[PDB]
Swiss-Prot record:
Keywords: Lyase, Periplasm, Signal
Pfam family, any one: Hepar_II_III_N
Chief location category: periplasm
EC supergroup of this enzyme: lyase
GO cellular component annotations of the record: periplasmic space
Cytoplasm as UniProt keyword: no
Name assigned to this protein: Heparin-sulfate lyase
Disulfide bond positions: none
Organism of derivation: Pedobacter heparinus (strain ATCC 13125 / DSM 2366 / CIP 104194 / JCM 7457 / NBRC 12017 / NCIMB 9290 / NRRL B-14731 / HIM 762-3)
Key word Nucleus present: no
Its EC number(s): 4.2.2.8
Record's catalysed reaction(s): Elimination of sulfate, appears to act on linkages between N-acetyl-D-glucosamine and uronate. Product is an unsaturated sugar
Amino acid sequence: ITRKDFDHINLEYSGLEKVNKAVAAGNYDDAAKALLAYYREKSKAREPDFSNAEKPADIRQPIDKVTREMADKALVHQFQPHKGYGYFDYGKDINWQMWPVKDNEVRWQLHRVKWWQAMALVYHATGDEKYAREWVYQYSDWARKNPLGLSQDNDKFVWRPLEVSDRVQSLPPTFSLFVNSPAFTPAFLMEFLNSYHQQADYLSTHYAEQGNHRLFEAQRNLFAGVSFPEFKDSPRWRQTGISVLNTEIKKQVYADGMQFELSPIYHVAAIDIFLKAYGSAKRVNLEKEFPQSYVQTVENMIMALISISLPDYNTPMFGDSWITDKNFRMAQFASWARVFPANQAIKYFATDGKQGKAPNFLSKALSNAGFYTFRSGWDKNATVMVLKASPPGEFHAQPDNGTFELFIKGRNFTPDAGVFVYSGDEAIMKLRNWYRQTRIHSTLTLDNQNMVITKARQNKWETGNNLDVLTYTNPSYPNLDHQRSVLFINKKYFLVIDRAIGEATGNLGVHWQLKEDSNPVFDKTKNRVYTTYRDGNNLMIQSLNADRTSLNEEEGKVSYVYNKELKRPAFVFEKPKKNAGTQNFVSIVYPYDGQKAPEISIRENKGNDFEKGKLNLTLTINGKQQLVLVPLEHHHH
Ligand SMILES: [Ca+2]
Ligand SMILES: [Ca+2]
């Protein structure tokens, strides 16, 4: 209504031509209507962006029963602020300070005003003005009753940056859905714009300098500037959001695209934070403000996920990670496909292979995180191994370097034991720590003890049609390095070479685990274990050591989801390390069809020298010889 109400708006912004000329002429009412008309036209030019929320509210999913309930209860001022509680009545005159229960979160979360998006959604679906009338009334009510500075009680609960950020993110798509209502007056527009501006600018001067709040607070501040770029401050809001996101992406994700905590499931969650900020900006052609390196890195994060994805769409259960829902994952890829629409691999993953193209690579190293995928292809019956030989992680990572999941013709033969449980009671902690033991993973131990760190150095990585080769060294114990080489041969089978290097003496164990239903045979005469699946899709793991080596079965368990566990087969090839001399293991991991395990022997040829990394072996497999001639190390003049 007044001149002051246009102070935060950039009147020379493209579209506001009539608003500026009207404010210049003192015709403020016409200026507001001209602004409303601009905003109405703008709202019709695009869908409302709901994508940024943790659960994106779909505009076209038929109005859920829970969503319609929330919008109808809001008409009588019954609100469900908090998901862990039911509805409360806040009165015909809304008491925003009410204490329905003695719990701070119920007050904080009330001011996330979740039900406004429900009212907007139901209004869009029905076209029923009662929802729009009530919302315009409720925002005005909220604004006039909860101004910044009202009291230190109310500021604490209404103007905490977290809630403020939640509102700057939720309000734009709500606005978009209500702005075309005749209940949305030109005066309410100005009350809303000036209230929204106060909140976004407050956020820009209050976002956290560090911690688990920093990311979404700055991200949401960028969204404010993306959603209402007409404010004078908007460019600055976008810049500060972007620089924080950018600083953090460079800190939290490696050059290979993998997120620093080394858990596939937390890697996936991280994609969404960094990707949605870019995607929301791109929808309105403001994405050029992101540096190229940011955009490249986000795409690399998706490509990294694709590389470690098994044919069932699950990722290996390394550290704190678990099995997940294929349909939901496909919807995630579909959301990502909209942002990177030229990428045929993302489209392929979005549509279960029906559209797009298989990724332009097979076996692949993520060399900073130390995730190595050996794969025959991307089809449903591919042989895929993902192996972890990583740098140090934190809470969500385990002492498991060397371990791997091997997926063959629809079956995961060697699922990681998993997490089982979060941190909690001392009794619950002993269980968590059982699952963090090295000895229950597919790698080498000394006296069955946990390795002291995961700090792999890659010695060699080479891909090829007929042969992929990995060699890395982990300092598993202070007096003992573990060097492991993995050879993927003829896209069919694996040779695993383990070397225990250093002064340490004791019992060396190379451990292996199998799927709960594999009912394996343990053959101590030939030091081989094989599964007995009736469908004939089977696996043999055999020690090819020339020196004395024992085979013993061990306690094994696998947890696919929290609080659920299954007994499963486990075993170890063992031999003593009597002195400071290096000890070598040669193991074959050999998939086969049928009920008859292959007969495999080995001959070390002249020129074979594990110390030099010169592998020169002849494997005889069911009577037929084949040469394995491979250098295990590189840069060794
Ligand atoms: Ca905060
Ligand atoms: Ca594990």
